[PDB]
Design a protein around this ligand. Sequence first.
Ligand SMILES: Nc1nc2c(ncn2[C@@H]2O[C@H](COP(=O)(O)OP(=O)(O)NP(=O)(O)O)[C@@H](O)[C@H]2O)c(=O)[nH]1
Ligand SMILES: [Mg+2]
Lengths: 141, 38, 586
Amino acid sequence: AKKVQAYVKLQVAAGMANPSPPVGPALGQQGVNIMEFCKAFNAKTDSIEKGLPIPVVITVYADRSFTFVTKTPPAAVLLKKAAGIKSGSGKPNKDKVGKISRAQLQEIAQTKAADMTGADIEAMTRSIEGTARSMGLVVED
Amino acid sequence: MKVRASVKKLCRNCKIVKRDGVIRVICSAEPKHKQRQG
Amino acid sequence: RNFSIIAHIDHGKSTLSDRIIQICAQVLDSMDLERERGITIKAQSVTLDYKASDGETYQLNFIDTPGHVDFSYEVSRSLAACEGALLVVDAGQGVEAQTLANCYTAMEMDLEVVPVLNKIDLPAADPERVAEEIEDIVGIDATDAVRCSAKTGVGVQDVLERLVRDIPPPEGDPEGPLQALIIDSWFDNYLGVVSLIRIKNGTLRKGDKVKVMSTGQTYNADRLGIFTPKQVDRTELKCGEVGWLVCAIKDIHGAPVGDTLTLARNPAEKALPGFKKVKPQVYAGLFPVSSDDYEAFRDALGKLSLNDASLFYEPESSSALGFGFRCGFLGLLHMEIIQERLEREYDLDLITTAPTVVYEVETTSREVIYVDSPSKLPAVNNIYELREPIAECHMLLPQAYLGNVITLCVEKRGVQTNMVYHGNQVALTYEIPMAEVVLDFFDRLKSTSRGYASLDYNFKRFQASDMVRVDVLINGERVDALALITHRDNSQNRGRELVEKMKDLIPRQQFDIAIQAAIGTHIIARSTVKQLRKNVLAKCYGGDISRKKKLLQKQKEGKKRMKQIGNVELPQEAFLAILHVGKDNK
RNA sequence: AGCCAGGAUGUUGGCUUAGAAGCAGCCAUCAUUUAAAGAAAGCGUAAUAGCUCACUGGUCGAGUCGGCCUGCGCGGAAGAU
RNA sequence: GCCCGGAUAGCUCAGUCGGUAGAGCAGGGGAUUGAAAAUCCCCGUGUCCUUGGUUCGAUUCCGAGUCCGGGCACCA
Ligand SMILES: Nc1nc2c(ncn2[C@@H]2O[C@H](COP(=O)(O)OP(=O)(O)NP(=O)(O)O)[C@@H](O)[C@H]2O)c(=O)[nH]1
Ligand SMILES: [Mg+2]
């Protein structure tokens, strides 16, 4: 499972299963029934909030069979949403753009506690600041 | 190979050697970096 | 029996032919253009009475074929005329790019193939290696295809034996309505239009009333017969056999190729399915060197084109050459040649030039007009939205070369509309400006992809851009002849380059000169010719300086006058090199 | 110094670009897993993947390192009977 | 290549210590004529040569560039 015969990590929109500029060609362009995947990845989608990126490393086999294994939505995106911005720093990063509550961030680790191996949950949020600080915005934490 | 008077290294792979009286840079990495005389 | 030989450029493919003729390079070839270069160029249908090992006398409607990217449409046709397809391959040179391309056309045609290891005499040859290299590629069986030389040979079997047992008999019923297919029809003076043809139904006796279909024309059957290695008449062509059909065709376009023909005694519905469509890859425009020539040169294509469909041309105009034609060549050899088939025949001297392309335009008003040439644009204040034509593309290449091809299209201004897929062989798509395409874009695909490529074009949709004129000044004398249209970022290079041709071919003048490409009044580039000047000082040598500034002061004060009267005749320069034709044959 | 290993997570950092995934550019460069690992020192890719150095373990068992001030030398250094 | 001054509407040009830019002409309209010139009147229709930076703010200031004029040096 964890070891792949030829895996393909790839960020992908929640709202689609068969685009092309995003994915299809992207899959290593190597043996994938896109007709399957479109019934595949979109099936998960109803549970998830739509229009947004989701990491989902894929696991190809010489069998041509595979088990795509969706993770959880990226931390870097969820900050911007509460921030309400449609993009990044826009202005150079050293100067601020966004804003965040101290209660914000704190559940962000809980949203992604799986990927986040951080022991203390409060400690886990320290990492979240990097997601925040690269945006350069001043969290009200 | 460039002659030049001030040889010195370029690539990290560059070597510097003193065959005869002459000095010589030697980068097995990039061929362009060969140099005599310095 | 029929078939038609197919292979990679230079592989005995025309060598094996006459050798086959000998059984019953040199020969087949006729024009001196073939004897030189040695490349095959016009396929020569042939026929012979082969004696089968089993005592049968199979008849062989043999057809040699050209092998080049530029001759693809000569090849696509001849396959139509025959069920068969011998596929010669080198023991050494391995599979071609074209040797693959010729097959994939054959695949959709569902035609039979009979692979053969030519040049097996080769010391370096690895004939055991070769058959392996088709199974994983051509997809055709070659597990045990017959080997043979071509030098002589061997002389094995010759493979006509294996050929006939793999070649279906022609399928069509005599007594039914006539359905000859036209093929490479080729005009002649005295005989009128000649028409090579592939009889499909019924048969064709002399003096009978044939009827061209789409034209609706009907004609007498004055002469006919299969073509041996030399000419031979016959009282009638049997069903399923090739041969010329001389008739009082007279007309330039009385029997266009691929139209069905039928006896007027009994018209059908009907078929046969028609050729074919083709598109230009290279796409340069030709101009007669002298305007007086244009008449005969206008009709030189009225005769040459019929001998060569792979051509496309329409009337076009230039600032410095009058009417000319915007040619649509299949490739650089196609252009190379026809470059000689005209001059070396009609003696119509010519000048190639980089292709013109049309531009839709909307004035400051609210209407459209198309701009064939740079000189005729509305004054820039008058313009509202100049718009670049775009061209659709359909490259079909293996993934190993994909990193090379995308890199090319992006420089050309591309937008990867699609990228999927077909197994292994990727199926890319792009929308690219035609101006960046018609100029040798086809070539780099045949270079970067190592010959494994494909293309398709069309007029598509116009698009606005930051594109602008780039006038060429000469001492402030703007020259309409050298006007250009380019995307602005491109302009600085086309800008600082166009002057560089001028600098090397404007003769030194008695006053200092100022070539300078510029947009509007703004000047994006400059070069200058140098003054000529008398030595003046060559005399004084007492060494006092004030006695020497007096002379040099006149040299300066007077050039200031000669500079203002100026004026510069510019004869044929507004032409050569400046219009590409700086290389031979020119 | 050499030889055997690891070289990870947040995460494609932010934008900007069709693409910007350690690496086309601009601002930033914290945080967790720890023996240890830069949001990256090169190679690499169309874009990813891919390969290394940096830092750590292992064997290894004797000095290693980079500057300073001075003596003398080496390249720089081609001409006409 | 140096020195000095420049690059502002379709064309010829005025201006800037760092404070939301103009003139004649061309073009497009109005008035006048039975309408036509002519004449008077009215609208700028620009990213201040292009590209990055500093400033609350840049047409000015700074960096890099492509250019124009004049003055030296090169220029049978
Ligand atoms: N020594 C040797 N030469 C051979 C052999 N087979 C072919 N050739 C040579 O290789 C060349 C190829 O012959 P040719 O018939 O022109 O091949 P082609 O593919 O028909 N040429 P084209 O594609 O231009 O028509 C000729 O010079 C021919 O003499 C062979 O077995 N041995
Ligand atoms: Mg040949």
